[PDB]
């Protein structure tokens, strides 16, 4: 319906490892399920994630997918793409905001499950939403580990059903998908490797004008090279 | 059926999102490249 | 010497950008997407 | 005196050579960027 948020309020409590921010959410969708029709909430990064993963477990046991939030607590620490939860304090806040609004748009993208009143009232208020959500309660973790070990033995005969007619496409695309994402994000890590030193090379292109200032000083040359300075800065 | 048809419409939606990011790169490349290269045009028709 | 080090693998990355279109050929085949990405192929080849 | 005045005129000459290489980079950048971005202009005003 309407989703126009303003991510503000960088309330920093700790810096470095897994910074927690009570950030502003301007809550649109003034449909009559939303009470005040114009309100903005704060969302503390230690609070709503654990309760949202509880609700994600709930709509997972009846069966749905989850939108990935900005991740933490063994989800945002163990191979998202590389790691570095220490960097989620001051510089990858824009990555947090980007994946955050991806998460919000995917919340909007389930309109049949958009009529869930509890999460609507929780995102509708700013109540410091139940701070016990930062958790480590993985007693079901080893349970689903040996359940996965059993399923890897006993999936084969059930694959031969009508499920095959619906799964052969997903298996082909997940094989092609893991191949293309391996190659593509390897290209992305090499891009992270060399674009930064490329930007440093453009900075050294700018410092080469001071190196020319350590040489013959002609103003016709100087206007050309000082114009090329802002040329290469615009290109970079 | 519901969630995989959600996957086809969601794949269409975010394929449209990154492809509108591609043609948006084309659009801001067009207008930026156009505006600063026509700003570079008089100092190209004169001394730089 | 650092330019000799990294411009060659940058050119190889542009070659892998071209091979990413065959990687897209290992995915959903829409001709409106295909014209855009095949146009971006010669774009990035001209830039490289 | 002869060879250092040769050095000042030769430094002026090859400073002019690499600076005309710089403004030549500006010139072929201007005409190449102009010609293929105006070639990309109709497929930017249409589907790419």
From TrEMBL, chain A:
It comes from the Eukaryota. Residues 1-130 form the PX domain. It is found in: Cell projection, Lamellipodium; Early endosome membrane; Golgi apparatus, trans-Golgi network membrane. Belongs to the sorting nexin family. This is Sorting nexin-1. It comes from Mus musculus.
